[PDB]
Design a protein around this ligand. Structure first.
Ligand code: NEN
Ligand code: NEN
Length: 178
C-alpha cells in the first residue's frame, strides 16, 4: 500500500491512454491498482514522474475527487479477489461529448483499441481521442458477466462498486452527450 501525491499529467502519451502514471519504483508497469479503495486504473511507468507521486489527467482527478498534491492511497488490485467470476464486461454504456459525425461502430472500435484489458466501472470519467478530437467519456453503466455463463446472471450496474475488464467482445453503447 503506497501513499502518493496527485499531479497533473497532460502529456497525450498518458492523458489519452486512461492510465495512472507512476514511478518505476512505486509500482510495476501495466498492472491494476486501486486508489482510495474505490478507483481502479492500469499503471504506466514514467521516468518524468517523482517517486511518491501519481499522475492523472483532469478527468481522472475529477472522477476521484482529487485536487493537485492531494495525498492518496494506492494498492495493487486483484479483480478476481474483488468480484470473483463476475469480472468481465459484457457491455458498457458511455456518455460521450466534445471536450470543453457520430459513428457508434467507429467510436466503439477506438475504445477497444485504446483500452482493451482495462478495468472500468460506472461513474468513471475518462478522456478519449477520436479522429483528431478529444472527448469526455463518462461510464454510465456496466453489465458485469462471468465469461463462463451463456448469459449474465447479474443486472446492469450503475454503482462504482461493480468493476469489469474490457474485452474485444464487450458491447459498447455510446450516447451523444446532452
Ligand atoms: C504525466 C506523466 C509524464 O511523464 N508526463 C509528461 C511530462 C505527464 O504529463
Ligand atoms: C488511446 C488510443 C490508443 O489506441 N492508444 C494507445 C494504444 C491510446 O493511448
Amino acid at each position: 500500500t503506497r501513499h502518493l501525491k496527485v499531479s497533473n499529467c497532460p502529456n497525450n502519451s498518458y492523458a489519452l491512454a486512461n492510465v495512472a502514471a507512476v514511478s518505476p519504483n512505486d509500482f510495476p508497469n501495466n498492472i491494476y491498482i486501486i486508489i482510495d479503495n474505490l478507483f481502479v486504473f492500469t499503471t504506466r511507468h514514467s521516468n518524468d514522474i517523482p517517486p511518491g507521486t501519481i499522475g492523472f489527467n483532469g478527468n481522472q482527478r475529477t472522477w476521484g475527487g482529487w485536487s493537485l498534491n492531494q495525498d492518496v492511497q494506492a494498492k495493487a488490485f486483484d479483480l478476481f479477489k474483488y468480484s470473483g467470476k463476475q469480472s468481465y464486461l459484457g457491455s458498457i454504456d458511455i456518455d460521450i461529448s466534445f471536450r470543453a459525425v457520430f459513428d457508434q461502430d467507429e467510436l466503439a472500435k477506438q475504445f477497444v483499441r485504446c483500452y482493451e484489458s482495462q478495468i472500468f466501472s460506472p461513474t468513471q470519467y475518462l478522456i478519449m481521442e477520436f479522429q483528431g478530437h478529444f472527448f469526455d467519456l463518462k461510464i454510465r453503466n456496466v453489465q458485469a458477466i462471468d465469461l463462463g455463463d451463456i448469459e449474465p446472471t447479474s443486472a446492469v450496474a450503475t454503482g462504482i462498486e461493480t468493476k469489469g475488464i474490457l474485452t474485444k467482445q464487450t458491447q459498447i453503447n455510446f450516447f451523444k452527450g446532452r
